[PDB]
Amino acid sequence: LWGPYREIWQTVLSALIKRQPEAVHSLIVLKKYKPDFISLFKNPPKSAQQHERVQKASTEGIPIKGTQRTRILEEQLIKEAFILSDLYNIGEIAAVELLLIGVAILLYWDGKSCMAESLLHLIQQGLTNKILTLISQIDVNNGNKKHRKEVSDLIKECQQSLAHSLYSWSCQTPLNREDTLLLIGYLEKVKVNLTLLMSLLYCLDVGFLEQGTDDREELMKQASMFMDRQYIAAIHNRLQNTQPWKSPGMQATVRLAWALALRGISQFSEVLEFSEADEPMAEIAIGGNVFLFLTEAVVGSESFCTDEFFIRRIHKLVTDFPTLMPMKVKQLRNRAEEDALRRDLEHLLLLIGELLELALEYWCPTLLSKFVRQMSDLLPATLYLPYLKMLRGLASGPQCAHYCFSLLKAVSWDHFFHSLMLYHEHLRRDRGITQRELDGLIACLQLTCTIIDWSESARLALCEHAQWMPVVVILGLLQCSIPPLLKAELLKTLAAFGKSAASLWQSLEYTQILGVGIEVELNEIESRCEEYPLTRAFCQLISTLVESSFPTNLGAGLRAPGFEPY
Amino acid sequence: ILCSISCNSKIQEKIVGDFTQDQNVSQKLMVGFVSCLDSEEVKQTNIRYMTKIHILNLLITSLEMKAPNLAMFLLGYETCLHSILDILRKGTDVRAGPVAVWDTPHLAELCYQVIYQLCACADTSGPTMRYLRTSQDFLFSQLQHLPF
Amino acid sequence: FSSFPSSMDPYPDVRSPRLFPSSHAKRTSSMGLLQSKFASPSISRAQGSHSPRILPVTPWSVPAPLAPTFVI
Amino acid sequence: FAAKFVSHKISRTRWRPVQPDVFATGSWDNEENKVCVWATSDPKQLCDIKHPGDVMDMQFLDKERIVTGSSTGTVTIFRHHENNQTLSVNQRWEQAAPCTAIVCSSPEIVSVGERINCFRAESRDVLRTIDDADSHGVTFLRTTEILTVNSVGQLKLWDLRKQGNDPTQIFSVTGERVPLHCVDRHPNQQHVVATGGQDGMLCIWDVRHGKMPMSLLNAHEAEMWEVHFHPSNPDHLFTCSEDGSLWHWDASAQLEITNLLPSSTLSVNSLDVLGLVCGTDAEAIYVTRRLF
Known about the structure:
This is part of a larger assembly, with 2 copies of chain A, 1 copy of chain C and 1 copy of chain D. Chain A is mainly α. Chain A has helices at 2-18, 22-26, 34-39, 75-88, 92-100, 104-123, 126-141, 144-160, 163-172, 180-189, 193-211, 228-238, 249-265, 274-277, 279-286, 290-299, 307-324, 326-339, 342-354, 357-363, 368-378, 381-396, 398-409, 412-429, 435-454, 456-463, 470-479, 484-499, 502-513, 516-527, 533-547. Chain A is globular. By secondary structure, chain D is mostly beta strands. Classes of the chains: A mainly alpha, C mainly alpha, D mainly beta. The PDB classes it as structural protein. Keywords: building block of vertebrate NPC., structural protein. The entry is titled "Structure of Xenopus laevis Cytoplasmic Ring subunit".
């Protein structure tokens, strides 16, 4: 029936293109394989049997739904069928319908894939009850080596699909809202988490914010006919720090993200003391590594089918945190970090950005208070080092990156360029500078590179703005003794100018004139070097330049073929 | 790249032996090709469309030059040849008024041009016509699915 | 595509008005005659003999930093 | 492995800068010390160099020039004008005691004695002279650092780049048993180095990773002779011993070392192999030109 499921999927896809039920309804069969879709990838009763013993039939004969197949059940077929039963813990006659239809194991996999895929597409109480069973079945399931690898890939696909189906059930409303504690606890028991994190965020941000269900009265004086607000309050009280709560750092993060949302759901301070019902519980979460977990998630960000949606959710979460929590931001940085902060916050912002909801958030950011905050960041060197990363995170979104750049601008870039020239001069007078200060500069140049590439106008401004003096400063840094991260950010800067050729080629020629030095650099590279991390960026820059049209004038000074030697 | 390699020169007898040195590997490759051919009966779909455009062009551009060659051994001539028949006798090139979907008759044309070369040549007309007259039906299956 | 390249070169609009921008144009290594005529007019503004010999010298070198010197 | 009797005990062999096809050779120990360029591949004695003075240093100073160092620590270099078959003797210095090895740092032909006289590219005046007596290891670890290895096999990183006359560092074995015959410095990275023990051992070295004796051996029989290494496969190399012997230690393979060469003869001359010889401690006559 796997082929039939595939055929149904095509019809569903056809409906999708047209936005109409028509393809599904113009092909009946949905209302035929309907409990097969509800059962999902479970084969829950027809696992391996000894009453279904295929080869003990002395006439070689088996029955299905309806007709029978005595003269075709020859000994080669018997062996493919028992190979299925031993391999997968599957009923023997079921394994035979799976060889008759369509390689039988592959067909069975397709049937699991087709139904699951169809469900995911649709999303994009048997079924709600069957999620747990499906999860359990997968756990039970968990040239030969290649086959094993293929099985592992299939398992990964299963752990990747279903993730969409579970998300969709949250979006449609069906698993709300008493299934939170069961979802959270299961997650605590458990990179697969990123499906889970993606699921949680929206629910905190909308479904647990103001929807809720009006039922689930597990207590008689806690809730009444309207459980909406009553459950929000019950979750708030339920959520706490405990002695082994610091080992599930994932639960801490999800619990903090609730407090972030919960701050905006609270109409006023009438019921709730802020300095017992928010600020300690959020602080206690901060001291349990919740912010670190978000950074880890950003590090773990990876392209997924629902991945863009997950990124949008992350952007929404970031918006919730700058929006409703600046007291916590100020408490951490402006009092506890400096004394014992802002840099950490900037790093977190960059992380979130890198991980189009994010773009929308960047657009929203795109004011006087924000400018004051930027000035404060510029004041302290550490604070300034947070700001560039934050700006790039705005930079990462395609709408967002341009918008983020505009927000940073509304001057600052020129000041950064001046610092680079000044910093370079200081270095010359004196990787020849405090590690925290150098890392700051790496972040300045990394925010610079990102903002230039993302927006054509910004890149153009960087390329040809006299005050900034980026091309010359970069060259001086390169010439002076310097660190590998720093030389990489010079090349990322050069990329903007490249995208903006004669000007670049002339500069290259000037550098060559200022190549014995280049040969020496190559020799140094051969001697080293820090694991080749520096090599790739330079190679990429060379490739972009090559993409740019060649100039006859360049290489003129050397005889005959200046372009060729590079 | 197999098309450019196998349409530049007259195929050497040594190469087939080298290919079959593994013995098992050639068979595995043939099985994989058959699976790819059968896989029909959106990025993945796009890839399939591209692969079909390439693979079918490679088999045609090799085929025009002559036989036997690498393609003949990969059709299981001393199978994938039956998969070409199996895909043809299942193909539905009409969707009930949303038009004959022009990718699908193009797929049928690419399968048929191989069969046409394999009944015109002396080498292949004897075996190919013999296996087109046995089950699974050739003339009967195509006249079943042919639309007006 | 040469015409397109010329248009792109003219698209820079570096400053108004400069023989230095004319040199920024010669960066491509191709120079319009009109510029040469203008240079000749400037030279005109024994002198003729020098121009004849100077022009020949300019003709001898087409390499970068040579045209600028010839122009000077 | 087409052998060829020169009937001349060879001391030098270069796959010339120009595969290992242009052979040149320098024949010491004869009554008018010998060297031939373009020989032989096929007689091709285009530049069978009539020459007083023997061959201490030797370098293909271009694809049409030839540098060398002469027997008394003198210096000798011509320009191998292979078109017109004559040449012009470029470098002729008197008292640069012979030199013990030959190094390079382009194009200052650095070397060591068994005192340093840094001549260089067109530097017909002896420019640098860190006249430090040496109690035969010579290379460019980085320009223009070097490491003098005295006949206690006693390596010591010095320079000629900055001023000074000491060494900057020193590599040393626990016992200094062998003398300065044959050390190694890897083209895989110019901070990677080894040596060959004159018992038949290796002596592998780590610059960055401490300074320990990394890898000895016990494989060859006699003094460390010289090693054929592939000029592009850094790892591929094979070992030898000072009767002229050669044990193929397949080091791009893992110890796969066998009776390699056309063996059992007297000694071998000097090493250059690309695409050949690995000259012994005693430099007799031998040949084979099939190095692929």
